Amino acid sequence: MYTFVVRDENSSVYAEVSRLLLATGQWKRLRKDNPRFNLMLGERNRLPFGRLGHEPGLVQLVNYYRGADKLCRKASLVKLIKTSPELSESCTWFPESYVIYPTREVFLAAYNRRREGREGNVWIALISSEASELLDFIDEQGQVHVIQKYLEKPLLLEPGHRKFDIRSWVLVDHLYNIYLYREGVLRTSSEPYNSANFQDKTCHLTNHCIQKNYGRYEEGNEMFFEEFNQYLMDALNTTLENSILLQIKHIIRSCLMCIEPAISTKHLHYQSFQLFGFDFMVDEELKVWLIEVNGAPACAQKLYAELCQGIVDVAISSVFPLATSIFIKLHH
Amino acid sequence: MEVIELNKCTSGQSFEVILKPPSDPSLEEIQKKLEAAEERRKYQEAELLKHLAE
Amino acid sequence: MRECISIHVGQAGVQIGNACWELYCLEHGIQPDGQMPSDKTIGGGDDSFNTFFSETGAGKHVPRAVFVDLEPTVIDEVRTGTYRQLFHPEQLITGKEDAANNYARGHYTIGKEIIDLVLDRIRKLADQCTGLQGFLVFHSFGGGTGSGFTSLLMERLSVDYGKKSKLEFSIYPAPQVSTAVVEPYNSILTTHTTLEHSDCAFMVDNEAIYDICRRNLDIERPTYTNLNRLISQIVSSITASLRFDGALNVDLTEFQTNLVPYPRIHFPLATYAPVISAEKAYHEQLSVAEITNACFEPANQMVKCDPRHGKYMACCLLYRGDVVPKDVNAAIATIKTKRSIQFVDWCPTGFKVGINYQPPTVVPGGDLAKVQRAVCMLSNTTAIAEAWARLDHKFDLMYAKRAFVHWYVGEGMEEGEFSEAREDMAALEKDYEEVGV
Amino acid sequence: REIVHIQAGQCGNQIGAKFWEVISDEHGIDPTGSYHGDSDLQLERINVYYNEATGNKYVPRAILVDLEPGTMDSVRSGPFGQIFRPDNFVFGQSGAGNNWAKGHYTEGAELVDSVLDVVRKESESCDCLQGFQLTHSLGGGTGSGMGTLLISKIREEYPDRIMNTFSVMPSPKVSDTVVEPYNATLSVHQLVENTDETYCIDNEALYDICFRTLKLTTPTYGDLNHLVSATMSGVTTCLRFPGQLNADLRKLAVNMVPFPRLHFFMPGFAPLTSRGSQQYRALTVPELTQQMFDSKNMMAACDPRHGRYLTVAAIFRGRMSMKEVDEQMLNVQNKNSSYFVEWIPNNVKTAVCDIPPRGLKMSATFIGNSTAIQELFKRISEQFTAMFRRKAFLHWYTGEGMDEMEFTEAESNMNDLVSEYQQYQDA
Ligand SMILES: Nc1nc2c(ncn2[C@@H]2O[C@H](COP(=O)(O)OP(=O)(O)OP(=O)(O)O)[C@@H](O)[C@H]2O)c(=O)[nH]1
Ligand SMILES: Nc1ncnc2c1ncn2[C@@H]1O[C@H](COP(=O)(O)OP(=O)(O)CP(=O)(O)O)[C@@H](O)[C@H]1O
Ligand SMILES: Nc1nc2c(ncn2[C@@H]2O[C@H](COP(=O)(O)OP(=O)(O)O)[C@@H](O)[C@H]2O)c(=O)[nH]1
Ligand SMILES: COc1ccc2c(c1)CCCN2c1nc(N)nc2ccc(F)cc12
Ligand SMILES: [Ca+2]
Ligand SMILES: [Mg+2]
Ligand SMILES: [Mg+2]
């Protein structure tokens, strides 16, 4: 029998992974601060990575990648893309982004370029049109904010003239295989989108929660991949694979292949896996855009069973073996 | 990648290589503390030898 | 020429010292009776091996070493080993009753009874030194003598030699090899009391040395002999500049200058490659780049930790064997790209480099194979504070129940030196984190 | 680092006498005292327990003490009796009559200075005296009452040496008299205060192991003492032979005893063997491990699963893979990490000796400081108050100067000990 502890009680995902683990009759659950675990489903901040991999006779495995915050923190993610050659300022799937602190680095010189063509100058934190309106919002909070080119021409689902984002769940295992969960989710705004009233950020901000209309066209403002592909076929004569999924698989492979030397636990004394949630935005031209990478990501209720079982088979049992796939291996 | 101060000799050589520029208590003070813990020992032993005497 | 006095304390210190001096002798061509054919300067010389040996009218070359152990067992094997004739009896000091794994017993109780005796035998070699540099102090964080008598001796040295340098080779405690359950108490107690007295300390975590011996020497369960012969190799790499003609790290001051910008934070991580088994009959000799790349694989460090997740302040490369500067800068160039090597903004991102052409020396009959070239990287990365976290945590677990506290108090200590030495640590861990984010 | 051995009373001297037989056979010394041995390992540390006599004979550093000449005449008549130094048979004639007050306060007071004189003689001879180990039983009168009295005087004269006992706990399953719970509660009070290490050899456990596990219908003290001399050899091992450890009484206490009163250890032996009959297949290191941790192999009738291990110390004797030991000892902890306290890191330590004991090709001795030993003292405290609440048999004691008050204090100090042992089983 393998042992495991559990240090994030708020984890809807690994809540399941603990539940399923025990139920194999081969996993037992020690107490939070018992060091003699094979597996740490650990906390989100200050996870004690320097304490893992020092238990003689214990193969230790944790469900986070020390370093992954570079890709999962909004200011960090910008910093990562501007300065790694692998991504370059000439990066074609990330919206223009600048880091401004509150007490404009080269943010101002871009906005003025837009005065040169009166081009779209919507941005986000939160959404304004004049720089002053926004800049005074970041010093009003006190922490570091990042501002980005709002996507003024997004793709709208009809019936509804409606906005949405796509969350893919990717699982990186101890070997740095990159597994895309085939089941995706579109988080859709029930509110018809319009570009006059930004401050009415309910048809602009696509967060499932912030949508406190909730349930009109599809249940829970969530359309899955089978419905959306059908709509794409019928409405645009294309498919989800060709028009959108390729690019998503390019971005996921790219972001993760970038930071690999910095987080790979290949020759290390403990080992990491981590589930990520990638959040994309497909514009009117069927171009996929990367918005946020989420390091502690929730699943969609319908899929927890399937995803959390695949976590066990791919990331947990691969290491601790016991007595087709739901994943796309992104090849590198 | 600048190499510098390269000194050679018969046994080997040495050099630096830059890839980028930047951006006590007293003997008596001991004697005290040492001796304070010899006392604390001799007291504790006395409390033992006293209790045994009872 | 300037001399260096080696002080081996406890069992770990004394046995590691044997491993080293034996190695020094092979490297310098001294034989176990202390005769050194190649020395023509008989009965003297301001040669560079004279940093570690003095010469006798009769031409013997005698370690500037002293061995101190609160207990006669270990230094007795020194007194009777192949290198007996090497040392002057006054050099090998022995107690009768050891410090029972007890920092307080070794520092206070038994400590006070021998500190004066040791410091005279130490002053006896200091008085054969035209220009004394400092001390190389070898010990363990875990023995009671190891941890407790070293801090007492360290404090005194800072008094009777305020002008000289003190360097440490400390064994950090690993449960596979460990003799004791209270070793986390002794580690914290001894570091807090010794910190302002050491100028530069190289930590060797027995865990690390042990897995290296298993992975790379195909040794099933390493003995102390396995570990110590490997630890000397690294010690020799680190001390070779003091004993050989060279331009890099020629005095104990240079180690501070080169590796220690801020003074507390004076624990340079050491990585060493290649460790090759003498049992392998066919072996492919590793290149300057293959060995230099191995300095950034954790699996080679004296302390397991992740330098990617930390920042550098300094970095030497100590090569021994067939290396030329050009192959080094090449391997450096390629590696700069592929590795996560982040320096503190206020330090240059450079590598001080030393090459000694004499290839590594292996003990006839040892576990290490001879090799054409080898390197020992010395990098003061903040990622070594991981070791302080680990140790400090164990300390916290036991101390919250005050388990074993009474054995210490009972020797004259005060439950407060416990929280005082641990606050210091809590500082040290904060210092590290400021420098590293 | 000499050890000075003291055996007091019927039980004391009988287990005492087997031990010397058992370890003289290991060190290859015969009843004449002349070494006829194989390895030199057998003489490297022989001085810990034996003084060396002219003519290169070996003389146990043993003081034989009793208030009655009976058992001590036996010990002399017995197989290794002549080995013992005759000046060290210190005895009186009255007897202590299964009475703790006769041994501690009257009959035993007359004789203790003469015992202490034989002690001091042996002590002076010594180079670095480690301390003392005493065999005795807590349920009779001499070794129980005079025993604790001696210990109380040795601590005054040698306040900084180590005090070690092997203390037989009384069991109704194997009892001489109804007052044995009184005697034990008085002694344990003493032991909480004046020993660094005592090994709790429960006669209840020795009986169960002789009855159940070794299928002995009607076990004698000889069958029980066989188990005792097996454990006594085992826990002594890292003191008598050279090794990586180089062990002594003080380090043993430093590492085993987190808090000072909690210094009562559960001994364990594996494989359990019955006298005479040898079985011929050695165990596999996996077997040694799960037996030595098996409560059926515990010599103090407690359930280790009813408590947590504060610290553990195990000793593997024979020729075997230290790799496999390591893997097997690591394997029991990680499987059963619950039953070890989390707040003493790496609290199990293992050691190995090449020489096995007479009759086995491999064996494991186990020294556990479990909080489950309270079960032992709870058992003796109940039996105690069953009688005391009715002041029963108390006259045999008030008759010798003792006072009801003294009984309340002991009962109480012991009930405290149980509380303490229960505090840490929850932390
Ligand atoms: N690498 C290495 N470590 C050792 C050696 N000897 C002991 N150690 C380590 O040192 C720690 C204990 O310190 P010791 O040096 O053995 O104790 P001591 O210095 O003699 O102090 P005492 O308590 O009086 O015995 C243990 O955790 C061992 O792992 C050795 O020869 N080589
Ligand atoms: N450049 C851009 N142009 C247009 N709309 C954008 C945009 N960037 C983000 N959005 C939309 O506005 C929302 C901004 O909020 P944000 O992305 O920070 O929420 P979030 O992604 O942090 C929630 P979670 O962490 O749970 O995924 C995005 O979710 C997306 O719906
Ligand atoms: N295991 C064991 N227990 C014994 C032996 N002899 C006596 N006992 C126990 O010791 C108690 C009697 O104490 P005893 O030593 O005989 O009285 P004393 O001579 O005055 O010390 C009883 O409870 C017995 O169970 C023995 O040889 N082996
Ligand atoms: C809590 O960890 C321990 C427990 C015990 C011991 C130590 C540490 C280190 C020093 C002495 N020591 C031992 N002494 C004696 N006599 N026998 C032993 C048998 C087996 C063993 F593994 C250790 C010992
Ligand atoms: Ca010379
Ligand atoms: Mg020692
Ligand atoms: Mg009797």
Closest by CA to D171, choosing from D162, D183, D180, D160, is: D180
Q: How many C-beta neighbours within 10 Å does residue C431 have?
A: 14
Alpha carbons within 13 A on the beta-carbon side of D158: 20
Amino acid at D341: V
B and A touching (3 or more beta-carbon pairs closer than 8 Å): no
**DSSP secondary structure letters along D272-339:** ---SSPPP-PPPPHHHHHHHHTSGGGBSS---GGGS-EEEEEEEEEES--HHHHHHHHHHHHHHTGGG
Which residue bears the tokens 């949405």? A164
In degrees to the nearest 10, what's the CA dihedral of D161, D166, D168, D169?
60
Q: How many C-beta neighbours within 10 Å does residue C155 have?
A: 22
In the PDB record, what is the listed experimental method? X-ray
Specify which residues A188 forms β-bridges with: A164
Instruction: Out of C254, C290, C417, C420, pick the active-site residue.
Output: C254
- Does residue D345 have a cis bond before it (omega within 30 degrees)? no
**Contact by Cβ (8 Å): D66, D10:** yes
Which of C269, C308, C392, C397 should we substitute to test contact with A (largest number of A Cβ atoms within 10 Å)? C308
Contacts of B52 in chain D (CB under 8 A): 152, 155-156
Contacts of A1 in chain D (CB under 8 A): 335
**Contact by Cβ (8 Å): D295, D303:** yes
CA pair distance A154, A203, nearest whole angstrom? 12
**Contact by Cβ (8 Å): D63, D90:** yes
CA pair distance D317, D23, nearest whole angstrom? 14
C354 among the known binding-site residues?
Answer: no
Amino acid at D135: T
- Comparing alpha-carbon positions, the chain D residue that sits nearest to C399 is D343
| First-last CA distance in chain C | 42
Which residue bears the tokens 């003792």? D402
**Contact by Cβ (8 Å): D195, D136:** no
- Comparing alpha-carbon positions, the chain D residue that sits nearest to B41 is D160
For ligand 3, atom 5, the nearest C-alpha belongs to D11
- Write down which chains contact chain A via at least 3 CB pairs under 8 A: C, D
Test A267 with C176 for CB contact under 8 angstroms. Answer: no
Test D260 with C221 for CB contact under 8 angstroms. Answer: no
CA pair distance C284, A40, nearest whole angstrom? 39
Which of B17, B28, B43 should we substitute to test contact with C (largest number of C Cβ atoms within 10 Å)? B17
CA pair distance C317, C295, nearest whole angstrom? 9
Test A57 with D335 for CB contact under 8 angstroms. Answer: no
Partner-chain residue, chosen from C207, C309, C393, that has the shortest CB–CB distance to A66 = C309
CA pair distance D371, D303, nearest whole angstrom? 10
Task: Please say if C168 is a catalytic residue.
Answer: no
CA pair distance D168, C356, nearest whole angstrom? 67
Test C411 with B37 for CB contact under 8 angstroms. Answer: yes
Contacts of C298 in chain A (CB under 8 A): 267-269
CA pair distance C290, D36, nearest whole angstrom? 59
Closest by CA to D241, choosing from D131, D317, D165, is: D317
Specify which residues D225 forms β-bridges with: none
Partner-chain residue, chosen from B22, B25, B40, that has the shortest CB–CB distance to C412 = B40
Closest by CA to D307, choosing from D297, D318, D293, is: D293
Contacts for A77 with CB less than 8 Å, ≥ 6 apart: A70, A71, A292, A293
**Contact by Cβ (8 Å): A5, A38:** no
What's the fold here for domain D1-258? Answer: Rossmann fold (3.40.50)
Residue C163 DSSP code = T
Which residue bears the tokens 């099933």? C220
Residue C245 DSSP code = S
**Contact by Cβ (8 Å): C409, C415:** yes
Test C304 with A53 for CB contact under 8 angstroms. Answer: yes
Contacts of C407 in chain D (CB under 8 A): 254, 257
Tokens of A314: 């791919």
CA pair distance D169, D383, nearest whole angstrom? 13
C12 among the known binding-site residues?
Answer: yes
Cα of C61 vs centre of ligand 5, distance in Å, is 9
CA pair distance A15, A9, nearest whole angstrom? 7
C45 among the known binding-site residues?
Answer: no
Tokens of C298: 């954790």
Specify which residues A179 forms β-bridges with: A171, A329
Strands (E), D78-217: 89-91, 131-137, 162-169, 197-202
Residue C295 DSSP code = G
Q: Which residues line ligand 3 (CB under 6 A)?
A: D 9-12, 14-15, 96, 98, 137, 139-144, 168, 170, 174-176, 180, 203, 206, 221, 224-225, 228
* SS3 call for D406: helix
Ligand nearest to the CA of C48: 5
Tokens of A276: 């990520």
Contacts of D160 in chain B (CB under 8 A): 45
Please provide the CATH number assigned to the domain covering A2-62: 3.40.50.11480
In degrees to the nearest 10, what's the CA dihedral of A152, A156, A160, A161?
30
CA pair distance D79, D25, nearest whole angstrom? 12
Tokens of A68: 């992954």
Contacts of B27 in chain C (CB under 8 A): 156, 159
Strand pairing of A39-41 and A61-62?
parallel
Cβ–ligand 4 distance for D115 under 6 Å, the answer: no
In degrees to the nearest 10, what's the CA dihedral of D245, D248, D249, D251?
-50
Cβ–ligand 4 distance for C181 under 6 Å, the answer: yes
Report CA C368 to chain centroid distance, whole Å.
19
Which of C223, C397, C401, C411 should we substitute to test contact with D (largest number of D Cβ atoms within 10 Å)? C401
Alpha carbons within 13 A on the beta-carbon side of C411: 24
| Domains of chain D, residue spans | 1-258, 259-372, 373-427
| Domains of chain A, residue spans | 2-62, 68-72+155-330
Residue C359 DSSP code = P
- Write down which chains contact chain D via at least 3 CB pairs under 8 A: A, B, C
CATH 3.30.1330.20 fits D259-372, yes or no: yes
C102 among the known binding-site residues?
Answer: no
Contacts for C194 with CB less than 8 Å, ≥ 6 apart: C150, C151, C154, C155, C168
In chain A, which residues are followed by a C-to-N distance beyond 2.5 Å, i.e. a gap?
Answer: 103, 125, 212, 323
C112 contact D CB<8A = no
Specify which residues A288 forms β-bridges with: A282
Q: What is the 3-state secondary structure (H, E, C) of chain C?
A: CCCEEEEEEHHHHHHHHHHHHHHHHHHHCCCCCCECCCCCCCCCCCCCHHHCEEECCCCEEEECEEEEECCHHHHHHHHHCCCHHHCCHHHEEECCCCCCCCHHHHHHHCHHHCHHHHHHHHHHHHCCCCCCCEEEEEEECCCHHHHHHHHHHHHHHHHHCCCCEEEEEEEECCCCCCCCCCHHHHHHHHHHHHHHHCCEEEEEEHHHHHHHHHHCCCCCCCCHHHHHHHHHHHHHHHHHHHHCCCCCCCCHHHHHHHHCCCCCCCCCEEEEECCCECCCCCCCCCCHHHHHHHHHCHHHECCCCCHHHCCEEEEEEEEEECCCHHHHHHHHHHHHHHCCCCECCCCCCEEEEEEECCCCCCCCCCCECCCCEEEEEEEEEHHHHHHHHHHHHHHHHHHHCCCCHHHHHCCCCCHHHHHHHHHHHHHHHHHHHHHCC
Burial of D307 (0-12, 13-18, 19+ CB in 10 A): buried
CA pair distance C1, C46, nearest whole angstrom? 5
Cα of C145 vs centre of ligand 1, distance in Å, is 9
Test B48 with D159 for CB contact under 8 angstroms. Answer: yes
CA pair distance A148, A146, nearest whole angstrom? 7
**Contact by Cβ (8 Å): C246, B9:** yes
Cβ–ligand 2 distance for A124 under 6 Å, the answer: yes
Report which secondary-structure segment, H or E, holds A171.
strand A164-172
* SS3 call for D112: helix
Test C305 with A261 for CB contact under 8 angstroms. Answer: no
CB pairs < 8 Å spanning A and D? 22
**Contact by Cβ (8 Å): C146, C17:** no
* SS3 call for C231: helix
Residue A157 DSSP code = B
Count H helices and E strands in chain B, helices first.
Answer: 1, 2
User: In ligand 3, which atom is closest to the CA atom of D144?
Assistant: 21
Cβ–ligand 4 distance for D302 under 6 Å, the answer: no
Which of B42, B45, B52, B54 should we substitute to test contact with D (largest number of D Cβ atoms within 10 Å)? B52
CA pair distance C255, C259, nearest whole angstrom? 6
Domains of chain C plus CATH, in order, are 1-268 (3.40.50.1440), 269-383 (3.30.1330.20), 384-437 (1.10.287.600)
**Contact by Cβ (8 Å): C359, C369:** no
**Contact by Cβ (8 Å): D260, D369:** no
**DSSP secondary structure letters along A245-261:** IHHHHHHHHHHHHHTHH
C143 among the known binding-site residues?
Answer: yes
* SS3 call for C182: coil
Longest dimension (CA), chain B: 81
CA pair distance C188, C391, nearest whole angstrom? 8
Contacts for A269 with CB less than 8 Å, ≥ 6 apart: A52, A53, A54, A60, C298, C299, C304
D335 contact A CB<8A = yes
Strand pairing of D362-370 and D309-318?
antiparallel
Sign of CA dihedral C138, C142, C147, C149: negative
CA pair distance B53, D355, nearest whole angstrom? 46
Test C350 with B27 for CB contact under 8 angstroms. Answer: no
C77 contact D CB<8A = no
Tokens of A192: 């018809």
CATH 3.50.50.60 fits A68-72+155-330, yes or no: no
CA pair distance A88, A80, nearest whole angstrom? 9
* SS3 call for A188: strand
Which residue bears the tokens 């230099």? C292
Looking at the domain covering D373-427, what would its CATH class be?
A: mainly alpha
Strand pairing of C350-356 and B12-18?
antiparallel
Cβ–ligand 4 distance for D256 under 6 Å, the answer: yes
